[PDB]
Design a protein around this ligand. Structure first.
Ligand SMILES: [Zn+2]
Lengths: 37, 111, 57
RNA sequence: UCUUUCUCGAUUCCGUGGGUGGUGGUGCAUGGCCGUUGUUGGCUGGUUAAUUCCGAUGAACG
């Protein structure tokens, strides 16, 4: 019963997933450059 | 956007989800999710079921609590030991909350 | 000290240097956006593509 | 900006006017709008000693 409940919970999680559905540093640097360029 | 909804855990879980199968309450959900609280240390899914059992546990299953207090307690000691060895916050916080609910409702009790 | 504006050099028959008579006298850039006519500037030490800034040396 | 040719193609660029002028400055009439000359109710997150901090987040009466 616990295994069946776990399978049902996994199916519910999959259904919810269906229902809901290095450059950062350099571009933050050029952001700080262009903020007061 | 989804927390403020009436169907969410804000209001309706506190009212109609406590009636597990039409009768409030059944810990068969709690005892069935042992396979999730065992051998799975994934965050943000343990926290959700911990929050849900924290809210559901308040609706007085008192003779069942007195009966399987041993099962709940051993489950909780393995939960706190694993979480203290791991070092998370949310799951520990609501397992403390459900400890509070269980000990308020009810030798090993001193432990 | 007045700054004079830059004037583009009006070169005579800029088209008439990439072809013979048939073939391409200059290289072709192998990029995705550029090709089949985007000729390749051949400077005395290098080659440049004038659209998407390709650089070979 | 000074060389060396690669590309974009009408999205143009040179000169002369005692001719206006417009991202102009300024005053008047001019339409809207503020302030100006009472009374009773009503929590996902990290953080601190701490209901600590930030962070999301209504009414009538004269
Ligand atoms: Zn090219």
């Amino acid at each position: 019963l616990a295994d069946i409940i776990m399978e049902k919970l996994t199916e519910k999680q999959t259904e919810v997933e269906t229902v809901m559905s290095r450059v950062l540093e350099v571009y933050r640097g050029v952001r700080e450059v262009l903020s007061k360029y | 956007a989804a927390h403020k909804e009436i169907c969410a855990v804000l209001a309706a879980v506190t009212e109609v989800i406590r009636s597990q199968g039409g009768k409030e309450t059944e810990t068969e959900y709690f005892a069935a999710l042992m396979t999730t609280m065992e051998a799975v240390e994934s965050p943000e899914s343990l926290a959700a079921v911990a929050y849900l059992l924290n809210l559901v546990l308040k609706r007085v299953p008192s003779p069942v609590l007195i009966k399987k207090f041993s099962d709940t307690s051993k489950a909780f000691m393995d939960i706190m030991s694993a979480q203290a060895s791991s070092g998370s916050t949310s799951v520990l916080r609501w397992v403390l909350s459900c400890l509070a609910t269980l000990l308020r409702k009810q030798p090993v009790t001193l432990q | 000290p007045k700054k004079n504006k830059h004037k583009r050099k009006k070169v005579k028959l800029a088209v008439l240097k990439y072809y013979k008579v048939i073939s391409r006298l200059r290289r072709e850039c192998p990029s995705d956006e550029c090709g089949a006519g985007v000729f390749m500037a051949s400077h005395f030490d290098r080659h440049y593509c004038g659209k998407c800034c390709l650089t070979y040396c």
